Write a protein that binds this DNA or RNA. Structure first.
Length: 60
DNA sequence: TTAGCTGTCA
DNA sequence: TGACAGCTAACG
């Protein structure tokens, strides 16, 4: 929900459109850089992939 | 058994 | 768009 939390999560995503699956090291590092919880970080990407990444694939 | 994906509500 | 119950794939 934090406006900042979105930005930090958006960057890594588009910085890894081919491998949008972070590691346990990056998951916590994102959580610390956002203050969110691990579960919050986990769910965000899973939603982001099918709402940000996948739609662009369809357009190709 | 855990990471990830689908379906889905407020 | 952030939640989580439920199903699915990579026997210890």
């Amino acid at each position: 929900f934090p406006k900042v939390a979105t930005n930090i999560m958006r960057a890594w995503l588009f910085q890894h459109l081919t491998h949008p699956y972070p590691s346990e090291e990056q998951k916590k590092q994102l959580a610390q850089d956002t203050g969110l919880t691990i579960l919050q970080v986990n769910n965000w990407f899973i939603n982001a992939r099918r709402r940000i990444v996948q739609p662009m694939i369809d357009q190709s």
